[PDB]
Amino acid sequence: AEHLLKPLPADKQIETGPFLEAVSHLPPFFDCLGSPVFTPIKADISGNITKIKAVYDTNPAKFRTLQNILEVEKEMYGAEWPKVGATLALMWLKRGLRFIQVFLQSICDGERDENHPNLIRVNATKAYEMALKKYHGWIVQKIFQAALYAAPYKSDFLKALSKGQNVTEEECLEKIRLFLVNYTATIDVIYEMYTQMNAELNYKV
């Protein structure tokens, strides 16, 4: 959470390069959940970032913003778009990013089960339901939900999130709150872009 995203400009265009740089630091979030069950999603999210970067690197100016990626790929691929290329990679990436956002916001806001205040089950469930659940077939849902149920104690989770740096739990939460400002605004704009451009696809894996 130390690698802040750029603030949104007035025109709400998101520059591809700085976005990819920032979100490249995020897949280790999944390691903090303490289950091998999250290794595939970590790899999938990393693969989405790699794919968007591969397209961007072929012509960074043509793909300068995320909006440019969608509009250029729509021209390139015709009727095959939006189920193609970096557009499809980003369609999936944003769901993993939203998962992280909702999870972290919920923890930072003090949301908890008062019967089990040192667990993060309720925060995990909220994040999963809001971001990913409907895109998973039932078999996947059961295993993914079981691993979230088996998440670390909240204090251990926060210790994992701040590994290395010498920070208190309170300082860790403060830093996450700061990170959440531009992160949330950016993910919201990406979701709105998918809606506006008719690039969203609702299918299960």
Taking the C-alpha atoms of residue 157 and residue 154, their distance in angstroms, rounded to an integer, is 5
162 among the known binding-site residues?
no
Q: Which of 105, 104, 92 is nearest to 49 (CA)?
A: 92
Taking the C-alpha atoms of residue 154 and residue 167, their distance in angstroms, rounded to an integer, is 16
Neighbours of 79 (CB within 10 A): 5
Length of the chain: 205
47 among the known binding-site residues?
yes
143 among the known binding-site residues?
no
56 among the known binding-site residues?
no
Task: Determine contact, residues 93/45, Cβ cutoff 8 Å.
Answer: yes
Taking the C-alpha atoms of residue 107 and residue 99, their distance in angstroms, rounded to an integer, is 13
Q: Which amino acid is at 108?
A: C
109 among the known binding-site residues?
no
Residue labelled with tokens 């995320």: 66
44 among the known binding-site residues?
yes
Q: Is 29 exposed, middle or buried (0-12, 13-18, 19+ CB in 10 A)?
A: buried
50 among the known binding-site residues?
yes
Task: Determine contact, residues 63/16, Cβ cutoff 8 Å.
Answer: yes
106: tokens are 């919920």
45 among the known binding-site residues?
yes
Which residues carry a binding-site annotation?
A: 44-51, 136, 203
